[PDB]
Subunit: 423 residues, 4 copies
Amino acid sequence: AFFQQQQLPAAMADTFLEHLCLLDIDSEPVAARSTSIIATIGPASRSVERLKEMIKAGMNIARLNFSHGSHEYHAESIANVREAVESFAGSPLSYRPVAIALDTKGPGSGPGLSEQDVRDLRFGVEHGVDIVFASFVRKASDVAAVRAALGPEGHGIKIISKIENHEGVKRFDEILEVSDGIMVARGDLGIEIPAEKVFLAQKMMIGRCNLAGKPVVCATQMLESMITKPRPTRAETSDVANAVLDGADCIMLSGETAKGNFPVEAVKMQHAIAREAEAAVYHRQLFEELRRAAPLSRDPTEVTAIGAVEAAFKCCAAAIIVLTTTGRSAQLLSRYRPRAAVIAVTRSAQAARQVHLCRGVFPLLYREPPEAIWADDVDRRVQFGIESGKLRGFLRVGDLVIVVTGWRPGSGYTNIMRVLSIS
Amino acid sequence: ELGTAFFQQQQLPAAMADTFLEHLCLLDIDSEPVAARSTSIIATIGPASRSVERLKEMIKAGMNIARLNFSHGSHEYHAESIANVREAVESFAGSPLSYRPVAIALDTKGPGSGPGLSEQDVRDLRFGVEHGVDIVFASFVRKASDVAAVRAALGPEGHGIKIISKIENHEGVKRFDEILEVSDGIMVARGDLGIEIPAEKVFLAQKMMIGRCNLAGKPVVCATQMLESMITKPRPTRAETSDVANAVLDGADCIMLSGETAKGNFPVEAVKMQHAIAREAEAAVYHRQLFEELRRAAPLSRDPTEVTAIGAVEAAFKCCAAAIIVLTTTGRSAQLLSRYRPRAAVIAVTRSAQAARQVHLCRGVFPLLYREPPEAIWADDVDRRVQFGIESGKLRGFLRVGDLVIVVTGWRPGSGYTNIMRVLSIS
Amino acid sequence: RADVAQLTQELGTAFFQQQQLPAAMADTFLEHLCLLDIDSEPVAARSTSIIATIGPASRSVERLKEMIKAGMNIARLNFSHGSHEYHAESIANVREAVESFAGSPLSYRPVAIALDTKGPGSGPGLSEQDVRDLRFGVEHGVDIVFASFVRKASDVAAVRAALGPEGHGIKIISKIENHEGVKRFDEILEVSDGIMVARGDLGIEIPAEKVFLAQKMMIGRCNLAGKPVVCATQMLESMITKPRPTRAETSDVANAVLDGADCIMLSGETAKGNFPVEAVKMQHAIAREAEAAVYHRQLFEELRRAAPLSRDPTEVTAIGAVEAAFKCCAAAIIVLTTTGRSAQLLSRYRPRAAVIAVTRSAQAARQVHLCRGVFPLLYREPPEAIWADDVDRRVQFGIESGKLRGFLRVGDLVIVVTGWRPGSGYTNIMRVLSIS
Amino acid sequence: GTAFFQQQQLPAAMADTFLEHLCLLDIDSEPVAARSTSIIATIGPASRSVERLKEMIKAGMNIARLNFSHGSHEYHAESIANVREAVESFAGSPLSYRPVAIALDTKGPGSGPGLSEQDVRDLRFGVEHGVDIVFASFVRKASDVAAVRAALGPEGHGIKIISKIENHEGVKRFDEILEVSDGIMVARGDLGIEIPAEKVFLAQKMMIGRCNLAGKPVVCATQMLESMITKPRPTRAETSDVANAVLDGADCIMLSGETAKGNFPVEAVKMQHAIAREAEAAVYHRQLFEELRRAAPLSRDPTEVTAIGAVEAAFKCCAAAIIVLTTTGRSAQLLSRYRPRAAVIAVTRSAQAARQVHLCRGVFPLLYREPPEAIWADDVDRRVQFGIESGKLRGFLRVGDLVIVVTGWRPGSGYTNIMRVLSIS
Ligand SMILES: O=S(=O)(c1ccc(O)c(O)c1)N1CCN(S(=O)(=O)c2ccc(N3CCCCC3)c3nonc23)CC1
Ligand SMILES: O=S(=O)(c1ccc(O)c(O)c1)N1CCN(S(=O)(=O)c2ccc(N3CCCCC3)c3nonc23)CC1
Ligand SMILES: O=P(O)(O)OC[C@H]1O[C@](O)(COP(=O)(O)O)[C@@H](O)[C@@H]1O
Ligand SMILES: O=P(O)(O)OC[C@H]1O[C@](O)(COP(=O)(O)O)[C@@H](O)[C@@H]1O
Ligand SMILES: O=P(O)(O)OC[C@H]1O[C@](O)(COP(=O)(O)O)[C@@H](O)[C@@H]1O
Ligand SMILES: O=P(O)(O)OC[C@H]1O[C@](O)(COP(=O)(O)O)[C@@H](O)[C@@H]1O
Ligand SMILES: O=C([O-])C(=O)[O-]
Ligand SMILES: O=C([O-])C(=O)[O-]
Ligand SMILES: O=C([O-])C(=O)[O-]
Ligand SMILES: O=C([O-])C(=O)[O-]
Ligand SMILES: [K+]
Ligand SMILES: [K+]
Ligand SMILES: [K+]
Ligand SMILES: [K+]
Ligand SMILES: [Mg+2]
Ligand SMILES: [Mg+2]
Ligand SMILES: [Mg+2]
Ligand SMILES: [Mg+2]
């Protein structure tokens, strides 16, 4: 029964053609949904009660579109999101962190960072946003300007550069090099370049981000018809599935959740499609290619990450449990696209929110009492991941897990991988 | 010899990549497609696309197959649609640069939950034979016996009509292998399939069926809601263009338009959009792995047509042949070349008007109907048809003097004897 | 180039010119051959063990010391010739030469002692002389038995029974010497610890032009099973009388290593020849060159694709450690082992990094010479009060010995493989350590 | 039939990985195909007898090597005459006649910087006596090849120059040497003295790989069956060396003292023949063809384009043979570079080209003696039928087999462009 579920016959195929031939509509997905859902907050999704339904449906990142609404409007949206998120904090083994992303208005006709963007970025730092989706990034200096406007207090905010025009596509490599990740902003991109070429830019950018090990978001009109209709079109479900098969870390909803009549249903639909698409991923070729393309490294976190993903595939590990302060150890595991869920146990609430940008990372916020012996504290965070995993359905007694830790406290010292039997 | 400009176009840097990941990384929005569009466009005929003048615009935009939906309209209504299509097609018989064969496909109403073929389908199928349709899109095919019933309804005079089985429910998906074995091809009928099975599972059924059809070397059509928003809007959504591109990258031989052309406000624009996306997607196909996998998966064969076809596709890739010119009576030799997905266009020269229309079901086949009177000496009749294919190729933009072409012929007249592959320099 | 650019900038272009590294990074086997370079010097320690047959030319304690320094890892006693008294003296001389270096772990070299049986002769089962010789082996503490003319699984069970309860730890390497042994190979390998491709008798039992097929098939199946395989007989035959081998002989040694053999053997070359030490030096020189020429990219990928999924944590840790070692060009994989099994499971994935196996078992230290790339270190310190400190001291012992022996340098990365509790069977930890 | 797929290591050939291919190698799987690696036998006191040479041709000798390091011009002229007499004794039966090449192996430069004066005299002797190939000793650079070419003069333009790589400089300057040479000999005797003995296998494997990539013949030479000079059976290292030279990709294997001065010249040839057939069946064509295909550059030459199409077609149907018409041997050489499992039966009217194509693995030359037919299409058909009739007589073909037929569109060399699939009747 285990080998009939999650497209395992198609996963064992020796060629991609045979993999497609073995895809089965009766093979049910078992693993947790890896691709994060970004939902744009607006009139249709602003209430605390509606936001609780969206968190339960699968929303991982709340997007604030600063093209519309005042600072007072967005502060209320943030407070409502935080209230809905913290309503589930009473059960720590099942609490789901939710990131808050600020999407900038953009430069418009201006040459650099607009004055409104400087004010909105400052607002973001003051309100503790986790991510910035920087509109119309055309070159590396645009990213440096966004970074500078965040100041010394916004050092930890992730900058996701939105590629929306020909210049952004042509200067992609220099933009990705200085950014934390990319958003394929298909709405403007589809007007700036011929509509029939957007798929080439999406597939290229996702590929280059996967190669770089940096998050990539597929955005705009994924389930457009769901703004007025309860069910999407056949092109829309195919688009969501293909963004996941392309290698996107995140999928987004704009009008579908901000102003549409079915915001919760749009989130449920993206969740349902993503789980199906993630099981249909051809890991045999994907891992081989990612593994071959990733350069040789003398960084112990990078070295441990490859060893752990290889070990997870060898035993069909249910999960890779990793201790992370900044999210980096979980991100380095995520770049190899393991089938095993990457359960990231962290004390940082911000890192827990931000790792939703990395596919297959399931953040757990550690709020249990400290142990006096560092080694004892480490084993406690590990047993915590195992209890949250059992509660959420990721793990069962008898499963094997790969545990990734470091040799001393503080970020940057991950160097250990262990094979553990559950219970 | 070819120049650096040649190797910058049609995603050639991405095509030479050693891995699929590197292939994606090398895809370039500035790399323009050069080759002719190889995925056929099926357009549904209705009130928005019925007039002779509108049909001429649709043929110019790229329509290769006209679909008659027998779920609506009388026999008199469909006969008029057929006559209007034929009039619009024959209006280009003058200029060889613009003349193009257009297939006529009859889409059946269906069993509507009843045993065997419905009485209306028996009558509509008989209408199709009497009006000389080329293809039948058989609705709600659930098992092999459904195909045999459609085949028996094509009566004594319609055995040459191609049966494309529409897979629209769970049973059709589960019994796919037995259905494909007795069918000429398949249509992934996503509209009903999306209601019959969970909407989030349709992509698995589409990708599986396209894969199995590619492995079998039989045509597969991707259908329904590809550019749905274009029924009321002049431009499609980002999901819609992505869907068209992904159906081509999946391996579909044909893409379809339904309400977009039958009843919408922009039928010609919907055809133009599918044409534009398909050309872009066909250049982005990763032929290196696709050919290797089709080669490895295809069983060994002692059929000389199958053996010649793989030799010719290999020869075309080796020299970047501008085209593979094949002589075919039934379309079979062109279909066997098409199954290996050559980048080179397959120019199929035939005396059969029906085979010329039907080969639009096979990706990359460009049919040329040959009407010259036969030569007393057979080898001369063959050379005249090879030169007809070269001159139409030169006229249409495929070929130039100095290009290399692969020519596929047989050792004796009649169907079933293809066994020769020649490398020719265009003079 | 982009997959090695930062590491090339860090380690230098000279590092990537040595040990056939340009040929190792090739994307195809054809390109790998095209990039093989006679100027690319081997850097790694020799990983294929040399088995030298002991005889009149290699019996003195002084000669045996020169053979240990030349590279002999396993001493073979051919029980087809000589009395029990003769073999006991050979064993004592080997042990005396081996223990003459036991003053420091960075100079000590464990040497296994293998007993090669006379065989069944015309008989259907175990001979009475073999029963006596096998009991002699147990009484004299031999590490391995090379069982002659193994034709089926019951032959190996008979050898195992004749070793008795005290010889349970002795490794049985079945010699395949005829058509029946080749046809029943799978059942023989299943019950044996390893195989010897006994080419001398095999070349008489089957057509001489078919021996290479049997050698390549058996080596492949042993590599797939993760069990040791020895290539034997006439590898450097002409060196019995000549100081230099023929062009076919050096090619044979290189090709046995490229085929995947864990061990290579010398018979008359060391037992009776005029150049026993030179024959060992020649096999050492060829094996080092051939090991660097191995196409690890395809070999590792194929060992992973062929190896079935495993729920054994030792097996899971071993593949993770080998993957980590390739990622950083680790100088070594240091493993703690009681029976040698954790080191054997690392060895089956054919890492380029040396597997330094730290053990308290003197017998396991001798027996792991059967596994390609395993460098045994015998730990002699008494156990620490805290188990977690005892483990750490053993790892530091492997690092300090590795530094003093040239395997490791300051700045190198090493992969360390340990377990969660004492006793055999609990390896489950892999650590990436920087050498300071 | 099931029996067909049990022979010639077909289970091992269908394997998905090289490791599984090795695991499936079967000593009971008998080779069926004709031996495709040519055997070069060195002529000497043990192999000059016209009667002994007839036995060596029957055993499998394809190329007779004259070592100009020993013997006078008078001695070598007699060698040539004896070889030609033994070869032409079988000309009475054209369907089974085997052409045999004559190769002149030069003495070399010695302490000199360039072409020695003795080599100039020996080279002119070769042109005057109609040798087919020159094995040029101690080639260190491209100018050495140009000097050998110049010493052959205007009448020796058709002679093939195989450069012998015997030292470190030849290995370092390999690419420039191969570019101007027709092929290479891995001259292991001197190479094993010039560089460390333990490095020769790296130079052999590299050179064979580069020659295979270039589509040019490569010869593995020296001490392959050395012990057979005095013993009736070779050592285990010797049979392994022959098998591994074939698995490496060598087009030719050589015998020196084994046939020139030993006591078992015919048995040494029979042993190389037996080992080569076994090793050729054990070749992992799945990866080999894929890699040769991927590495070979795109081509606009119709002979090259036809050759790859014909090799692909031959693999698709398990063709027993690829029958090619060739004037210079080039069309057959271009088929050979893709290492088809199907025998390449080359029909030619050029006696020299028939002898020289023995340098290309898997090329079986047939000398066609009939004067041209008036109708060119009938002349082409008669040659193809001669290849079929020869192939049936020699065991290459049977009724029911499929064969790939490679021809051109007009007479003369350089116009091959047609591939056809033919059923044997
Ligand atoms: O060559 S294909 O286009 C073909 C399509 C139809 C066929 O029937 C077929 O045989 C051949 N094919 C396309 C799908 N992929 S895939 O395995 O799904 C895959 C998909 C995506 C990959 N990354 C790397 C690039 C960034 C995103 C993640 C991958 N990395 O490695 N493999 C990958 C195989 C290759
Ligand atoms: O990767 S390997 O070293 C390995 C893999 C797992 C093993 O278990 C093993 O022992 C070793 N391996 C070594 C043998 N070859 S091979 O298939 O015999 C072969 C042999 C030779 C090839 N050319 C290129 C060089 C000139 C001659 C033709 C070839 N081109 O493509 N394949 C080729 C596969 C690759
Ligand atoms: O992924 P990051 O940010 O580098 O954090 C990983 C760090 O977490 C740990 O596992 C635990 O460290 P702390 O006890 O400081 O939380 C470290 O050993 C390791 O360096
Ligand atoms: O693709 P099909 O239907 O088998 O037709 C291919 C046939 O066409 C030809 O090339 C030409 O035949 P005709 O002269 O009868 O048209 C035949 O030699 C070959 O058998
Ligand atoms: O390779 P083996 O034979 O399983 O031995 C590995 C064992 O060695 C250890 O690393 C150390 O164990 P000891 O304290 O008994 O020496 C164990 O944790 C592990 O189980
Ligand atoms: O391999 P080569 O030397 O190019 O010779 C091939 C030539 O042989 C032929 O097949 C037959 O030519 P001939 O009639 O002159 O022998 C030509 O059509 C072709 O050009
Ligand atoms: O800004 C965006 O999100 C877009 O343009 O798609
Ligand atoms: O009938 C159709 O075309 C469908 O259901 O999509
Ligand atoms: O016994 C042996 O070692 C042999 O026969 O090779
Ligand atoms: O010259 C040769 O043949 C050699 O040196 O091997
Ligand atoms: K915005
Ligand atoms: K219908
Ligand atoms: K013995
Ligand atoms: K010479
Ligand atoms: Mg925008
Ligand atoms: Mg329908
Ligand atoms: Mg023996
Ligand atoms: Mg020499």
